[PDB]
Amino acid sequence: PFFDVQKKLGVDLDHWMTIQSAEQPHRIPARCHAFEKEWIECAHGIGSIRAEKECKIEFEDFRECLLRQKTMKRLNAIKRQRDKLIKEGKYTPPPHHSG
Amino acid sequence: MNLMITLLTNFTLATLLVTIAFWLPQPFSMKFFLVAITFLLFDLEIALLLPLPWASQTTNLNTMLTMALLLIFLLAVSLAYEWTQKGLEW
Amino acid sequence: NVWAKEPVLVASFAIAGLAVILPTLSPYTKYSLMINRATPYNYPVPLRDDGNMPDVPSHPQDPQGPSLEWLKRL
Amino acid sequence: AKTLLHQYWDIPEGTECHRKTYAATSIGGASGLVVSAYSVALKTPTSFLEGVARTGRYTFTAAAIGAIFGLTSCISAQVREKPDDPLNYLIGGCAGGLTLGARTRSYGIGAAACAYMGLTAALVKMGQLEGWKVFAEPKV
Amino acid sequence: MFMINVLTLIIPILLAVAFLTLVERKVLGYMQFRKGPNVVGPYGLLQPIADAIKLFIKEPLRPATSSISMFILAPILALTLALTMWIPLPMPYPLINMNLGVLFMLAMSSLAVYSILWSGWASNSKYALIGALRAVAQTISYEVTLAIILLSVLLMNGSFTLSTLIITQEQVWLIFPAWPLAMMWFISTLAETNRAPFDLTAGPFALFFMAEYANIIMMNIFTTTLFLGAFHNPYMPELYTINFTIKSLLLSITFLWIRASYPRFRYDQLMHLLWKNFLPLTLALCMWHVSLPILLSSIPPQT
Amino acid sequence: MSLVYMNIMMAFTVSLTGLLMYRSHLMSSLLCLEGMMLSLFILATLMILNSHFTLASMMPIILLVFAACEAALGLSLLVMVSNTYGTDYVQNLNLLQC
Amino acid sequence: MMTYIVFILSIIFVMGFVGFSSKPSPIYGGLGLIVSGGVGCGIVLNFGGSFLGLMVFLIYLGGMMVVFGYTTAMATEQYPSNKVVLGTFITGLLMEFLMVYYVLKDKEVEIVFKFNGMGDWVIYDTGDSGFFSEEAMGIAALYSYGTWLVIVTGWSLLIGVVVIMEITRGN
Amino acid sequence: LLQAEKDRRVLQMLRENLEEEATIMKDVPGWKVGESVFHTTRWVTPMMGELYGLRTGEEILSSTYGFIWYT
Amino acid sequence: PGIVELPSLEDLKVQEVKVSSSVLKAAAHHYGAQCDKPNKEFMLCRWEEKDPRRCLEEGKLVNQCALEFFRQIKRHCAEPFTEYWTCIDYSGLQLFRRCRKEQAQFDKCVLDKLGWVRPDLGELSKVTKVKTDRPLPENPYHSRARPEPNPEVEGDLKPARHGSRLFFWTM
Amino acid sequence: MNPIILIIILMTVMLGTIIVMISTHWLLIWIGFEMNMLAIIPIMMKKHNPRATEASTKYFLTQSTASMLLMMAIIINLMFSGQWTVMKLFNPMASMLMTMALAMKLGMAPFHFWVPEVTQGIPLSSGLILLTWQKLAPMSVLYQILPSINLDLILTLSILSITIGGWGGLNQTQLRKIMAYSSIAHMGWMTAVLLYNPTMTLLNLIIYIIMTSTMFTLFMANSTTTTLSLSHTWNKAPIMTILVLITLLSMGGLPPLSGFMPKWMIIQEMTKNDSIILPTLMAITALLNLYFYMRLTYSTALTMFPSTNNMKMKWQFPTTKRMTLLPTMTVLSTMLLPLTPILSILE
Domains of chain G: 2-168 (1.20.120.1200)
Report which secondary-structure segment, H or E, holds G160: helix G148-167
Return the partners of chain A (3 or more C-beta pairs < 8 Å): C, F, G, H, I, J
Neighbours of J111 (CB within 10 A): 20
Among the residues of chain E, which ranges form H helices? 2-10, 12-31, 46-57, 68-83, 102-123, 126-140, 143-154, 163-168, 179-192, 205-227, 237-259, 267-273, 279-291
**Does any domain span residue F46?**
yes
Nearest to J161 by CA among J203, J134, J138, J191: J191
**Cβ within 8 Å, pair F66-G153:** yes
Provide the number of structural domains found in chain I: 1
Cα E151 versus chain centre, distance: 17
Q: Within an 8 Å CB–CB cutoff, is residue F77 touching chain B?
A: no
Does residue E249 contact residue E111 with C-beta atoms inside 8 Å? no
H7 within 8 A of I52, measured Cβ to Cβ: yes
Interface probe for F, chosen from J23, J54, J167 (most Cβ of F below 10 Å), is J54
Burial of I24 (0-12, 13-18, 19+ CB in 10 A): middle
Q: Are E111 and E84 in contact (CB under 8 A)?
A: no
Q: Three-state SS for I129?
A: strand
Q: Which residues of C touch A29 (CB under 8 A)?
A: none
Q: Are the CB atoms for E228 and E173 separated by under 8 Å?
A: yes
Chain J CB contacts of G166 below 8 Å: 1, 5, 42
Helices E12-31 and E46-57, packing angle to 10 deg? 110
Cβ distance E66 to E129 under 8 Å? no
**Closest partner residue to J338 among I163, I166, I169, by Cβ?**
I169
* Contact yes or no for C53/I117 (Cβ under 8 A): no
Contacts of D28 (CB under 8 A, 6+ apart): D59, D62, D63, D64, D65, D66, D67
Helix segments in chain B, DSSP class H: 2-23, 31-49, 52-55, 61-84
What's chain I's Rg over C-alpha atoms? Answer: 30
CA J271 to chain centre: 25
Whole domain around residue I14: which residue ranges?
1-137
Tell me the C-alpha distance between D108 and J276, whole Å.
32
Minimal-distance CA residue of chain A relative to I143: A38
Domains identified in chain B and CATH numbers: 1-85 (1.20.58.1610)
Pairing of strands G115-116, C47-48: unpaired
Instruction: Supply the DSSP string of A34-66, one letter for each residue.
Output: HHHHHHHHHSSSS-SSHHHHHSHHHHHHHHHHH
| J244 φ/ψ sector (left φ>0, alpha ψ -120 to 50, else beta) | alpha
Indicate the residue of A34, A38, A54 with minimum beta-carbon distance to I148: A54
How many Cβ atoms are within 10 Å of G69's Cβ, its own excluded?
Answer: 24
**H-only helix segments in chain J:** 3-22, 26-40, 50-79, 92-106, 115-120, 124-145, 151-167, 175-192, 198-220, 227-236, 239-252, 261-271, 277-288, 291-297, 311-314, 327-334
Q: Which residues pair with I130 in a beta bridge?
A: C48
Q: How many CB atoms lie within 10 A of CB B25?
A: 11
- Which letter, b or e, does each residue of I84-119 get, where b requires 16 or more Cβ atoms within 10 Å of its Cβ? bbebbbeeeeeeeebbeebbebbbebbeeeeebeeb
Q: Is I71 a member of any domain? A: yes
Contact A45 I143 (CB under 8 A): no
Contacts 24+ apart (CB under 8 A), D91-97: D91/D118, D92/D118, D92/D121, D93/D69, D93/D117, D93/D118, D93/D119, D93/D120, D93/D121, D93/D122, D94/D118, D95/D68, D95/D69, D96/D65, D96/D66, D96/D68, D96/D69, D96/D121
Contact I63, H1 (CB under 8 A): yes
Q: Do C61 and I119 touch (CB under 8 A)?
A: yes
Query: Which residues of G fall within a CB distance of 8 Å from A73?
Result: 116
Which technique was the structure solved with, according to the deposited record? Answer: cryo-EM
Provide the 8-state DSSP code for J113: G
- Buried/exposed code over E13-33 (b: 16+ C-beta within 10 A; e: otherwise): beeebbebbbbbbbbeeeeee
* DSSP-assigned beta bridge partners for residue C47: I129
Give CA–CA dist J262/J253, Å, rounded. Answer: 8
Q: Is B40 on the interface with F (CB under 8 A)?
A: yes
Secondary structure (3-state) at G115: strand
In chain F, the residue whose alpha carbon lies closest to the alpha carbon of J72 is F40
Q: Which residues, at least 6 apart from F87, have a Cβ–Cβ distance to it below 8 Å?
A: G76, G77
Contact assessment for residue E215 and residue E222, using Cβ atoms and an 8 Å cutoff: no
Looking at residue I164, what DSSP letter applies? Answer: T
- Distance CA(E115)–CA(E107), nearest Å, equals 13
- Chain H residues near residue E96 by CB distance under 8 angstroms: 71
What whole-number distance in Å separates Cα of residue E28 and Cα of residue J4? Answer: 57
Counted across chains E and G, CB pairs separated by less than 8 A come out at: 56
Query: Distance between CA atoms of I68 and I80, rounded to whole angstroms?
Result: 19
Per DSSP bridges, beta strands C47-48 and G108-109 are unpaired
Residue I4 C-beta-side C-alpha neighbours within 13 Å: 24
A68: left (phi over 0), alpha (psi -120 to 50) or beta: left
* Residue-by-residue DSSP string for chain H: -HHHHHHHHHHHHHHHHHHHHHHH-SSSSS--SSB-SS-SSS-PPP-SSSSS-SS-SHHHHHHTSTTTS--
Q: Which residues, 6+ apart, have CB-to-CB distance to C54 below 8 Å?
A: C64
Instruction: Closest CB to G141: pick one of A25, A69, A79.
Output: A25
For residue I101, give every residue at least 6 positions away whose Cβ sits within 8 Å of its Cβ, in sequence order, or none.
none
Strand partners, F25: F89
Asked if I65 contacts I35 with a C-beta cutoff of 8 angstroms, the reply is yes
Question: What is the phi-psi region of residue A91: left when phi exceeds 0, alpha when psi lies from -120 to 50, beta otherwise?
Answer: left
Q: Quick one: which of J129, J127, J135, J126 has its CA closest to J106?
A: J135
- The structural domain count of chain F equals 1
CA F53 from chain center: how many Å? 25
Give the separation between CA J180 and CA J182, rounded to whole angstroms: 5
Report the Cα I1 to chain-centroid distance in Å.
32
Q: How far A25 CA sits from the closest chain H CA (Å)?
A: 23
CA distance F48 to F59: 9
Strands I129-130 and G115-116: unpaired
E51 and E37 in contact (C-beta within 8 Å)?
A: no
Q: Which of B22, F31, G69 is nearest to E118 (CA)?
A: G69
Query: What are residue E95's phi and psi, to 5 degrees?
Result: -70, -45
Element (H, E) at B24: none
CA dihedral sign, ordered J97, J101, J107, J111 = positive
DSSP 8-state code for residue G108: E
Residue of B nearest to F70 (CA): B41
E161, E115 in Cβ contact below 8 A? no
Confirm whether F52 is domain-assigned.
Answer: yes
Set of chain E residues whose Cβ sits within 8 Å of the Cβ of B73? 287
DSSP assignment letter at G116: E
Q: Which residue type occupies H70?
A: Y
Minimal Cβ distance to I129: which of C49, C61, C68? C49
Phi–psi pair at F82, nearest 5 degrees? -70, -20
E98 touches chain H (CB under 8 A): yes
CB nearest J35 (choices: G112, G159, G171): G159
Contact criterion met (CB < 8 Å) for A81 and H56: no
Residue in C8, C11, C19 nearest the CB of E287: C19
User: One-letter amino acid identity for G9?
Assistant: L
Kindly tell me the sign of the dihedral angle through the C-alpha atoms of E65, E68, E74, E80: positive
Degrees (nearest 5) of the Cα angle G60, J83, G112?
Answer: 80
Question: What's the residue count for chain F?
Answer: 98
Pick from J19, J28, J38: CB nearest G159: J38
* Bridge partners, G109 (sequence order): G115
Interface touch F37/J68, C-beta < 8 Å: yes
Buried/exposed F43-80: b ≥16 CB within 10 Å, e otherwise:
bbbbbbbbbbbbbbbbbbbbbbbbbbbbbbbbbbbbbb
Distance, in angstroms, between A78 CA and closest chain J CA? 26
- D71 in Cβ contact with D21 (< 8 Å): yes
Cis upstream peptide for J147 (omega within 30°): no
Query: In this structure, what are the phi and psi dihedrals at residue D45, rounded to the nearest 5 degrees?
Result: -60, -45
Domain that holds residue F58: 1-86
Q: Determine the Cα–Cα distance for residues E204 and G97; give it in Å rounded to an integer.
A: 38
Burial of E208 (0-12, 13-18, 19+ CB in 10 A): middle
Give the burial class of B81: count Cβ atoms within 10 A of its Cβ; 0-12 exposed, 13-18 middle, 19 or more buried.
middle
Q: Is E213 within 8 Å of E17 (Cβ atoms)?
A: yes
E272: region left, alpha or beta (phi > 0 left; psi from -120 to 50 alpha): alpha
Q: C–D contact (≥3 CB pairs within 8 Å)?
A: no
- Residues in F touching B40 (Cβ below 8 Å): 68, 72
Residues of E in contact with C35 (CB under 8 A): 297, 299
**Cα J70 to the center of its chain, rounded Å:** 21
Residue I10 lies in a domain: yes
Give the alpha-carbon dihedral of G17, G23, G28, G32, to 10 degrees: 0
Examine residue I142 and state whether it is found in any structural domain, yes or no: no
Query: How many residues are given for chain G?
Result: 171
Residue I156 lies in a domain: no
Q: Provide the 8-state DSSP code for C40.
A: -
Cβ neighbours around E255 below 10 Å, total = 20
Contact D116, J258 (CB under 8 A): no
CB contact under 8 A, H39 and A57: yes
**Amino acid present at G107:** K
Strands C47-48 and I129-130: parallel
Contact J78 F73 (CB under 8 A): no
Q: State CA H16 to chain mean position distance.
A: 9
Touch criterion met for D and G (3+ Cβ pairs within 8 Å): no
Measured distance CA(E34)–CA(E29) in Å, rounded: 4
Q: How far apart are CA G50 and CA G43, in angstroms?
A: 12
Report the gap between the CA of E42 and the closest CA in chain B (Å): 28
d(CA J122, CA J141): 28
> Among B62, C13, F69, which residue's Cα sits nearest to residue G155?
F69
Contact J19, J138 (CB under 8 A): no
Q: C-alpha E242: how far from its chain's center?
A: 20
Beta-carbon contacts of G133 under 8 Å, excluding residues fewer than 6 positions away, are E99, G50, G51
Are I131 and C59 within 8 A, CB to CB?
no
I152 is a domain residue: no
Determine contact, residues G133/E159, Cβ cutoff 8 Å: no
In 3-state terms, what secondary structure has residue C22? coil
Q: CA separation (Å) from G100 to B24, B35, F6, F11?
A: 42, 45, 11, 13
Backbone angles phi, psi at G20, to 5 degrees: -110, 0
Q: Are the Cβ atoms of G23 and F31 closer than 8 angstroms? A: no
SS3 J67: helix
In DSSP notation, E9-36 reads HHSHHHHHHHHHHHHHHHHHHHHTT---
CA J57-J61-J64 angle, 5° bins: 130
Closest CA to J195 of J278, J252, J137: J278
CA–CA–CA angle I32, I37, I41 (5° rounding): 125
> Quick check: A78 and H53 CB within 8 A?
yes
Which residue in chain E is spatially nearest to G73 when comparing CA positions? E121
Domain of F11: which CATH number?
1.10.287.3510
Whole-angstrom distance, CA of residue J29 vs CA of residue E193: 44
Question: Is there a contact between E281 and C35 if contact means CB atoms under 8 Å apart?
Answer: no
- Secondary structure element (H or E) that encloses residue F88, with its range: none
Alpha carbon of I116 to those of A99, C60, E27, E231, I79: distances in Å? 46, 13, 64, 34, 17
Give one DSSP letter per residue of F19-59, joined into a string: HHS--SBHHHHHHHHHHHHHHHHHHHHHHHHHHT--TT--H
Instruction: Enumerate the residues of chain H whose CB falls inside 8 A of the CB of residue I46.
Output: 3, 7
Check: CB of residue E129 under 8 Å from CB of residue G72: no
Best residue in B56, B59, B72, B81 to probe C by mutation, most C CBs within 10 Å? Answer: B59
Q: Check E284 against C19: CB less than 8 A apart.
A: yes
- In the three-class reduction of DSSP (H, G, I as helix; E, B as strand; rest coil), residue J25 is classed as coil
The one-character DSSP state at E233 is -
Instruction: Give the whole-angstrom CA distance, residue A5 versus residue J18.
Output: 11
Question: How far is the C-alpha of J307 from the C-alpha of B86, rounded, in Å?
Answer: 50
Cα–Cα distance for residue pair D55/D77, rounded to 1 Å: 33
Sign of CA dihedral E110, E111, E115, E121: positive
Residue of B nearest to H68 (CA): B1
Q: Is C68 helix (H, G, I), strand (E, B) or coil?
A: coil
**Whether A6 contacts chain F with CB within 8 A:** no
Query: Cβ distance E204 to B21 under 8 Å?
Result: yes
Check residue I2 and report its DSSP letter: P
At a CB cut-off of 8 Å and minimum separation 6, what does I71 contact?
none
